[PDB]
Design a protein around this ligand. Sequence first.
Ligand SMILES: Nc1ncnc2cc(-c3cccc(S(=O)(=O)NC(=O)[C@@H]4CCCN4)c3)ccc12
Ligand SMILES: Nc1ncnc2cc(-c3cccc(S(=O)(=O)NC(=O)[C@@H]4CCCN4)c3)ccc12
Ligand SMILES: [Mg+2]
Ligand SMILES: [Mg+2]
Ligand SMILES: [Mg+2]
Lengths: 564, 572
Amino acid sequence: HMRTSQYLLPADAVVISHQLLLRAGMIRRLASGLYTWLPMGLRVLRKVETIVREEMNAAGALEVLMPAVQPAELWQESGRWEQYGPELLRLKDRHEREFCVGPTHEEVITDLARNELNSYKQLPINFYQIQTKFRDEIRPRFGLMRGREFIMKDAYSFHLSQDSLQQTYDGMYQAYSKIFSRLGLDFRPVQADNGSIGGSGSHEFHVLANSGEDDIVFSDSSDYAANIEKAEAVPRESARGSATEDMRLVDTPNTKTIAALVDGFQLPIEKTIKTLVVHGAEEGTLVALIVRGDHELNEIKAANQPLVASPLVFASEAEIRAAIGAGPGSLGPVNLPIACIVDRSVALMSDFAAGANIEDKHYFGVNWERDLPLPEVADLRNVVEGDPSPDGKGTLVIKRGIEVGHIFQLGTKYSEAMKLSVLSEQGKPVNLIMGCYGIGVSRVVAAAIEQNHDERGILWPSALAPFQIALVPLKYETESVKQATDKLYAELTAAGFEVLLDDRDKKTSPGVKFADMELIGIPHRIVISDRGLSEGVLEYKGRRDSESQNLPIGELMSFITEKL
Amino acid sequence: HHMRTSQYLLSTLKETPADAVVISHQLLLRAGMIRRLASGLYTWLPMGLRVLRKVETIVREEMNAAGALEVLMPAVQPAELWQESGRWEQYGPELLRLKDRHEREFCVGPTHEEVITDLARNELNSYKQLPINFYQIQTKFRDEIRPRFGLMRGREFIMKDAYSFHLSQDSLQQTYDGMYQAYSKIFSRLGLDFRPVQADNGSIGGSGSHEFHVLANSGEDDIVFSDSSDYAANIEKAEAVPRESARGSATEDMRLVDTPNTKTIAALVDGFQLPIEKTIKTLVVHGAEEGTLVALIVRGDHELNEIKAANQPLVASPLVFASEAEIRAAIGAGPGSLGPVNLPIACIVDRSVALMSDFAAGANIEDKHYFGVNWERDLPLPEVADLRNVVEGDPSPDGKGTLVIKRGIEVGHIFQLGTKYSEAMKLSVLSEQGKPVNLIMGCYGIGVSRVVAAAIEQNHDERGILWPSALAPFQIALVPLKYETESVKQATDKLYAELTAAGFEVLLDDRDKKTSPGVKFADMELIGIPHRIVISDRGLSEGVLEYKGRRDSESQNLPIGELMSFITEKLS
Ligand SMILES: Nc1ncnc2cc(-c3cccc(S(=O)(=O)NC(=O)[C@@H]4CCCN4)c3)ccc12
Ligand SMILES: Nc1ncnc2cc(-c3cccc(S(=O)(=O)NC(=O)[C@@H]4CCCN4)c3)ccc12
Ligand SMILES: [Mg+2]
Ligand SMILES: [Mg+2]
Ligand SMILES: [Mg+2]
């Protein structure tokens, strides 16, 4: 008998999921980013794991279990030993051999693949695991959301052709949809950054919650959906305005922000531009990226520009001063001695202000072609709320998302570097084309609470509830109650329901018991008492019900079976 | 959606390393169940993972039935907890230590005593909560100095580790007996021939422990049984009593003899035609009093038991043998010339040595021995104790029968820990009376990875693996002949669907004719699948399938109409 004598058990906790996971006796902190699953919490995790496993299996993926401790030599082959960065936990064994604790498993599976895959007849094939990762998050926080040790489902698929990858990638995308549907989450798949302008080689899956760290973008009139990183921006204006002012050089002291320029000289913000200087791909060069004053530079879009070094490095003040002859706050496209790219919206601007590339000065009345030639145009900005959908169908809305899934097309990145090759039917060597697919299993648990909670505590989706029914007997010590209760437990448990019986003594009031069952998020409660048994009635309340109701002892099993 | 050999069996060319010297390691490799990543680190391949999960499930069912609560604790653990217990320093070089990016110190958990104790001192705040038993099935790491024998001595491996908490020793005993009973059901259900034995607590510590062993010829432990009672013990723990009932009369006078180039029992025996049962070995070890030495004496055919030796109050624990320089300074003679006569250090003799007569021993003079030594006449008998290992045929210490020594693979070990952690880490709860009680603890471990391998060590034949029923990765193998032909394909796929629907685990061999039927049949047997069904045109035209059991010598025809009834019968 699962009893409450066994199972039940701030300041550091800021987000709701962290607070309620602690209070509901689901997890306990061991150290920074390291949490034990308590008995109640583990039940939830297992239900997530099961559903994930079920759908992965149904999509044709084969479950493996790879080691956490991995030899550095494999990581040196991929170059990620160095390149992965300080989240990689590195160590040495007693023989001074070097290893990491796995943040992910691309290298391990690739090593497996090149030893186990030696025929085209084995392909396509998709391996996955549900296994504990380590990532040395610099500032572990938000409970399970940014842990160091966490549970991930990671899958890896191997292919002979790009078309074969697409099929599996689609099937994985479809499997993710089912998973998150069955977990009863309000979620969305979105386009994500694949490291190029255009393409659909990456997708994310987000639990919609107001605490989400990602901004995700949807058309209100189409299927368009993307992370703001990936979301294409097109201008609200259809044409460039005609020149109505002459360009003039103006003294602008203490004017190093858009706000200073707007308020100082009573300009509309739509008539100002920012110039950000970044390193170019060509050694020792700089590029100027220009967005409108009320817009932000998208750093993903910036880096993805051929001309711009990837990853993105902003120029130092000294670099900018040596190159241009003035500093941030006084920069612009007029008499600019470095390469320049302007945003689509900037290209349609007119009679606009800009730094003069002379300290504490701006040009007003700048017009393209008349005053200077228009530089290369590109999509450089973040979309904003209400912008046109880039597919040409509707306007954009911006919601917050908690990423719980992320899929990728890898190409031959790993297969080239680690020499994973298979002979085709024709006998031509083929570097295997690869995809990989990840779900933050432990993040999912937290994300469910972020989305689903109330003032009484956790509201589980039905598939995640640790127990289905809570039996609350009043003065279980009385033997008449303690026979009805135990009969009830037996029947319900026999009918294949998960039941928790509150076995606690009189020192725990019925009120506290009711609060705990709701805090933990049990969807159904039944109350037994002498008063109730006398009249042959049981008291039943739903988790999201306003008031309790009385049910005849005989008709409960039929009633409860309906609810569940 | 079928489970197919083209996916599951992976490469034809298997790892065949030089160190693959045990059968479990070889067959696990050859049947595509594990693959090596590095020393002591193995991936569970799809076939192999299926077997692991079946062990875990049964383990989990019985832990839950014994009322233990499943948790899941981190692998990476802060050093500060290990410093509280003292094990940060004391555990030794099998503890894998590391630093994070902030220079903070951690280990990867070899076991979780400190973590579960730290949990208890935060979660256990009332006597009404006790007794309570927590367990997990979770990946450990131990930096085994020479990883070998595949899964048996890995570095990363799966353990089910449980920990119980108690206000009294009587409470602990009840739970400990429950876990003992629960372990028996697990290994019974896993279809293993196993035995629980009395054990030493070892480095885990405490007083009172048992091991569970799978009986196998490749077992690293020596396990001792009576031939007439239920007496069972690891040779580490097994009490030794003499075969001799009393001390024989002195027949020889003691005399000094020159014995140059005589520094082994064998050399003494061969040199002087002495029975080995009339010789003694003197081992000099460090005493508990710092700077002191103790001589331990066993009969020349016997071995010193190092656990028994360390447990002697006079002898330092852990056991340290004295150097030749220490011995020569102390005694004036070296190894090969040592004995109890005119010995200027403390001495302890084995029980069997106490009953010896007319024996030979080193004279504590270089290159000399005494022959015809007799206790009391020539020198007083020093302290007596149980110092040796038992041998085949010795009296059972319980009094019933004579001992027999078998070889065992340890797959479980349970311990009574007392308060060694709860005292060190300040874990206390008030009793009903309101008095502070340091919680009394026990811990229980099953080597889940080792179980998989141990099953193969015990159960195999010339054709490959023999899985016990509950462990087989699949129950049925469908081997269609000309799966490409639509008739056989339709029948095969139909057959897969029906069997799957009944709840059987089926593997379909979808490989083309480049893999011959003979290789297919061998592959299926090597993996250890208990039942196969062959589908062919010649069969379907007669309305029969060709069945064969893994343990059968011949096939038999099976009418299609009686499929479920026949196969159901076989799988029961
Ligand atoms: N600190 C953390 N705490 C809790 N959950 C976490 C989940 C991920 C996570 C989850 C899914 C996918 C990814 S990923 O990095 O975008 N992708 C991968 O790792 C790929 C896909 C699977 C194999 N490699 C990260 C990263 C950090 C986490
Ligand atoms: N190198 C290895 N490879 C594979 N499996 C292994 C299992 C154990 C193992 C298994 C069970 C119990 C123990 S133990 O050390 O005797 N006891 C404990 O660790 C106790 C039991 C619960 C936790 N502490 C070790 C030790 C090394 C192993
Ligand atoms: Mg670039
Ligand atoms: Mg300036
Ligand atoms: Mg001692």
